[PDB]
Amino acid sequence: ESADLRALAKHLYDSYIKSFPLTKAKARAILTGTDKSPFVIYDMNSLMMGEDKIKKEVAIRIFQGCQFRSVEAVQEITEYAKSIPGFVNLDLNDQVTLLKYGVHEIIYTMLASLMNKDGVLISEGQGFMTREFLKSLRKPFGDFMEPKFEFAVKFNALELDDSDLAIFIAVIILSGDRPGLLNVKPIEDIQDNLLQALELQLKLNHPESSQLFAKLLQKMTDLRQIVTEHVQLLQVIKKTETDMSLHPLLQEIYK
């Protein structure tokens, strides 16, 4: 019955709002247009005054900032996952496995909410780092964000809102096809119900948007592609920068 799917969609949106302090709705209000104006970093000097206004060479300081943020995001995504009905009843090992593989796919999904074609919000939306400035960073740091911007521009053309994204990131987490899953079936049973919830949500929220459900699911391919490209870039850094710390929580995820 659709009444149960709407209850599920409302539950997850409620938990999404409780778990993720910077929503897409707030991100868009900041990015578009007096109290919410970000400071804008587009070079080293603006970065210099930015570190003052908002708050080791430039590329590395930016890189570890990303690390700290990703860790914070993992923590938010973990909190959100525990609210997905059934998730915490799964085998403990499968819970770790689902988070291990799902966490970066969600990060890039939600990172798009903070992006437009020209740059990305930072520091809880207080700042805005331009795409060009990041693309101009020393090799191989200048290659990190561009694939993410490329995805975001197309993903954002779907015009999903937070209530759509709450169900969609839940679908990503409950993927029965992650390597090493000990009991696939209860995961798939949760995802099927999440998939039913998503389907009804997009049909009601986007009545004119034909086959949005199918297009959103095909986007899960771009997400996988971004991860593997990102993993390769990290292995270059581990050898180029033997003095540079990578956070152990992220180390364990990438293992």
Ligand X SMILES: CCCCC/C=C/C/C=C\C/C=C\C/C=C\CCCC(=O)O
Q: Is 120 in the site for ligand X (CB under 6 A)?
A: yes
> Closest separation between CB of residue 123 and ligand X, Å?
5
Compute the distance between CA of residue 137 and CA of residue 44 in angstroms, rounded to an integer: 10
Contact yes or no for 238/200 (Cβ under 8 A): no
Q: Is 124 in the site for ligand X (CB under 6 A)?
A: yes
Q: Is 100 in the site for ligand X (CB under 6 A)?
A: no
Contact yes or no for 29/36 (Cβ under 8 A): yes
Compute the distance between CA of residue 110 and CA of residue 100 in angstroms, rounded to an integer: 17
* Helix intervals (H) in the chain: 2-19, 24-32, 44-53, 58-82, 92-111, 131-135, 146-156, 162-173, 184-205, 212-240, 248-254
Binding string to ligand X for residues 1 to 20, with x set by CB under 6 A, is what? --------------------
Q: Is 161 in the site for ligand X (CB under 6 A)?
A: no
Can you name the residues that pair with 116 across neighbouring β-strands? 119
Q: Which two tokens stand for residue 204?
A: 């009601």
| Binding segment (CB under 6 A) for ligand X, from list 93-101, 118-126, 162-170, 237-245 | 118-126
Nearer to ligand X, 67 or 193 (CB): 67
User: Total binding residues for ligand X by CB under 6 A?
Assistant: 14
Query: Which value, in Å, is the radius of gyration of the alpha carbons in the chain?
Result: 19
Contact yes or no for 143/240 (Cβ under 8 A): no
Of residues 56-85, which lie at the interface with ligand X (CB under 6 A)?
A: 65-67, 69-70
Binding string to ligand X for residues 196 to 225, with x set by CB under 6 A, is what? ------------------------------
Q: Is 122 in the site for ligand X (CB under 6 A)?
A: yes
Within 8 A by CB and 6+ apart from 104, the residues are 227, 230, 253
> Closest separation between CB of residue 104 and ligand X, Å?
6
Nearer to ligand X, 217 or 227 (CB): 227
Pairing of strands 39-41, 115-116: unpaired
> Closest separation between CB of residue 204 and ligand X, Å?
29
Tell me which DSSP letter residue 37 carries: P
Per the annotation, binding residues for rosiglitazone are 67-70, 104, 230, 254
Per the annotation, binding residues are 67-70, 104, 230, 254
> Closest separation between CB of residue 31 and ligand X, Å?
12
Binding site for ligand X (CB under 6 A): 22, 65-67, 69-70, 111, 120, 122-124, 129, 234, 250
